Design a protein around this nucleic acid. Structure first.
Lengths: 272, 149, 46, 77
RNA sequence: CUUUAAUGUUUGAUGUUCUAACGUUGACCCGUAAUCCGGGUUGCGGACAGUGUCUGGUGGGUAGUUUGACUGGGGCGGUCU
RNA sequence: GUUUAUUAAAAACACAGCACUGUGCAAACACGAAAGUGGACGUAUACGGUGUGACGCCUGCCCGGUGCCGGAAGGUUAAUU
RNA sequence: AGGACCGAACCGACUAAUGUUGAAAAAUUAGCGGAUGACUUGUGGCUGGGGGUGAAAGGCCAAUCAAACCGGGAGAUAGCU
RNA sequence: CGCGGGGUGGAGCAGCCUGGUAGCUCGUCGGGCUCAUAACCCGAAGAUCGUCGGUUCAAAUCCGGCCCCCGCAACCA
């Protein structure tokens, strides 16, 4: 569910919040909740290094699971929650192999349904399976970079990276930005997409809300000085070149990889 | 680089090296298997004096890679004890990387750490196909048989 | 407008100590240079 | 580290004078292949830090003497 | 001699390919009821990312320097034998 | 909301939205000799940076040049044999 | 109910009269705006000078900021006073 | 910054290689045709053949500078 506001205050006129059916009072007990040491941009060297991130109300939000690998046993559900930094809902899940966690919602999960991790039997939806048995015409979420890691790609509210070959020792998948990668065929992933695909009807309209989600406001480059944006400073808002990043390169281009191990899996790239 | 190279598979086809090399097969393949001899160029003439006594002993110490190529490209029906999770599959919360690993506490050391999978291996009890390192340069199909553990 | 100096000596003691400072080379060079000069204190922080 | 474990080394003094003919420092380094070697009578790998050309020293002397000096020192974790 | 296949022979390039170097914020046990670190095993990339040496493209992101006299003071201008 | 403390409190700056682009996670990015850590334990409905500035109606022509993206038939080319 | 409002304590400083070798290195009286919020804010902690840090003014770093300090190079050098 | 093919009357072509020889289609001007406009046909002027020079009895063409399209140099221990 979402709650959308009408004009009824300034600063309320357009603002949208994600609510849930299954509610709770205050902070929940510690076996599901752990100091995540959140630093609002600041590193081990004492400096704000991530720029225009942080500020507002403190966070201490749970770590959640993205490994999803399970002995195939049914599960119960206790309450459905929305996350303060992930954009999707996360079930509080009580598997009958006695487990207790939070887990990300797949294409389906309920108070009487399981998740598999089987090689030829998790072939149904919402069940984690190796990518050999997922078609060249079937969406996929949970996509892990090497076998046993747990997903790093397509982990957000309605996001998928759909398979376009599955033949040979790799699986070929298409990326929601213009790039194309190979992922080895024995890595686990899940048929379908993440829950909470309806998130996209959250339009917001109160600036204090991104400030407490730990994102600081960012300024115009022409009101910055030339060490933070070189097409900036001086009188009467300069134009006659294009805008710029301060890493000695542009902002409408220049491809970058500092460590280049990311390119070894990527077999084709974004174009313009 | 100036060494005395001592192997008789994969790509080496001499039981000595008396001059310099652009390629270190030493500290690469031969020192991982205790089957190389060192050189200062102070002793290569000496090595070739010592070789008339030595080589018939030494020929077996340089037979460690030979072993692996010989005994695995032969036709084979590999008995493996494997375990199944509660969904009946050998893949419930196991997956690919635990269904092989078992030498963790008991046994001796083993010559393996990678295999590209063009098929799914180790699936359930019974025969199954497994495309593998018959030698560490040479990829060809062996047959597996999975039994209960 | 607002207070431009705080009173708290906690922040002085863990900024400018002895033990925490000797461990580092450049703090050891403070303790050396001050001591050789001849001053009745090497830290001003107790 | 740029200090090899078979020969003593330093990153030395280093300048241009080869593309503008004016001597401005750029400094020169070794490589530092942080490199494994094997111990058969322990059925394990132990690690010796070698540089470029410094690996060529280990090849020409013999690994075994270097490998024995780490045993003589004890392995420590 | 030239081009040049078969192919003997040294070295440079290539295609396809392997794990055996190398990596491993893949995974499991173990020192160790230490998130370090390391090896063992086993998953995955791979003789590559890497990094030194060399060297070509790009690049004021950054740092040290450099940017006339004459002249009805003279900026600019014009002139300089 | 923020505003040159002890000149400007605004017609500058911010914001949701809107367009553009980098970035597939060991992320781009930041800082540190580099290990490293923040980003984020989030992960393209996310994160950096750009111009513009909720909301109704919109944005016609066009890449000369500037940086950048991508592709191909193929001659040579440092480094080097 | 409300990043609505009028408003103390609690926080700020648009205007106006004064102060301007002052009571005070912007404070006073009085109009004025936040105060249930992107608010007010104590303790403990952290980044050190062309370096941080900045809802950005090229602002703020000990009633000081468009460039904090000392011990050495150092008798810096000055087609110069 | 070099070697070679290309650069047409006001507009667009044909000719183009040891080469000279200006020819076709439009716009124009006289003629022809349609009741008339119109396009279309014959003839005529226009010729700076990208711009400058050089070689040759003769340069649009070959040769050297430059600006522009393309093939090659796009790099040097």
């Amino acid at each position: 569910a979402v709650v959308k506001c009408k004009p009824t205050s300034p600063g309320r006129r357009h603002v949208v919040k994600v609510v849930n059916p299954e509610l709770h009072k205050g902070k929940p007990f510690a076996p599901l909740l752990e100091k995540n040491s959140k630093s609002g941009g600041r590193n081990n060297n004492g400096r704000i290094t991530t720029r225009h991130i942080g500020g507002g109300h403190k966070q201490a939000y749970r770590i959640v699971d993205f490994k999803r690998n399970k002995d195939g046993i049914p599960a119960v559900v206790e309450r459905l929650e929305y996350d303060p930094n992930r954009s999707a809902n996360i079930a509080l899940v009580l598997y009958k192999d006695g487990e207790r966690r939070y887990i990300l919602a797949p294409k389906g999960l309920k108070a009487g349904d399981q998740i598999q991790s089987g090689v030829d039997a998790a072939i149904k939806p919402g069940n984690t399976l190796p990518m050999r048995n997922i078609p060249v015409g079937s969406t996929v979420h949970n996509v892990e970079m090497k076998p046993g890691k747990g997903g790093q790609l397509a982990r957000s509210a309605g996001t998928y990276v759909q398979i376009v070959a599955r033949d040979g020792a790799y699986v070929t998948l298409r990326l929601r930005s213009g790039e194309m990668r190979k992922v080895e065929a024995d890595c686990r992933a899940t048929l379908g997409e993440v829950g909470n695909a309806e998130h996209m009807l959250r339009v917001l309209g109160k600036a204090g809300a991104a400030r407490w989600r730990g994102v600081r406001p960012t300024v115009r480059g022409t009101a910055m000085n030339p060490v933070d944006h070189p097409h900036g400073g001086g009188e009467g808002r300069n134009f006659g070149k294009h805008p710029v990043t301060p890493w000695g390169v542009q902002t409408k281009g220049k491809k970058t990889r500092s460590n280049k191990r990311t390119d070894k899996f990527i077999v084709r790239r974004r174009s313009k | 680089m100036q060494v005395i190279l001592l192997d008789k598979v994969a790509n080496l086809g001499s039981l000595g090296d008396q001059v310099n090399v652009k390629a270190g097969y030493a500290r690469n393949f031969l020192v991982p298997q205790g089957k190389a001899v060192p050189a200062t160029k102070k002793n290569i003439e000496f090595f070739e004096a010592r070789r008339a006594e030595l080589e018939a002993k030494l020929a077996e110490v340089l037979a460690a890679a030979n072993a692996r190529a010989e005994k695995i490209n032969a036709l084979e029906t590999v008995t493996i004890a494997s375990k199944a999770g509660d969904e009946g599959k050998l893949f419930g919360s196991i997956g690919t990387r635990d269904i092989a690993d078992a030498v963790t506490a008991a046994g001796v050391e083993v010559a393996k750490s990678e295999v590209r999978l063009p098929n799914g291996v180790l699936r359930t009890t019974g025969e199954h196909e497994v495309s593998f390192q018959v030698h560490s340069e040479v990829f060809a199909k062996v047959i597996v048989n999975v039994v209960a553990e | 407008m607002k207070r431009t100096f705080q009173p708290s000596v906690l922040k002085r003691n863990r900024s400018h100590g002895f033990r925490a400072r000797m461990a580092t080379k450049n703090g050891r060079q403070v303790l050396a240079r001050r001591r050789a000069k001849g001053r009745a204190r090497l830290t001003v922080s107790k | 580290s740029r200090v090899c474990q078979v020969t003593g080394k330093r990153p030395v003094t280093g300048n241009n004078r080869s593309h503008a003919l004016n001597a401005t420092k750029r400094r020169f380094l070794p490589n530092l292949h942080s490199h494994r070697f094997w111990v058969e009578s322990e059925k394990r790998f132990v690690t010796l830090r070698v540089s470029a050309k410094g690996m060529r020293v280990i090849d020409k002397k013999g690994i075994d003497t270097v490998l024995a000096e780490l045993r003589a020192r004890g392995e420590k974790y």
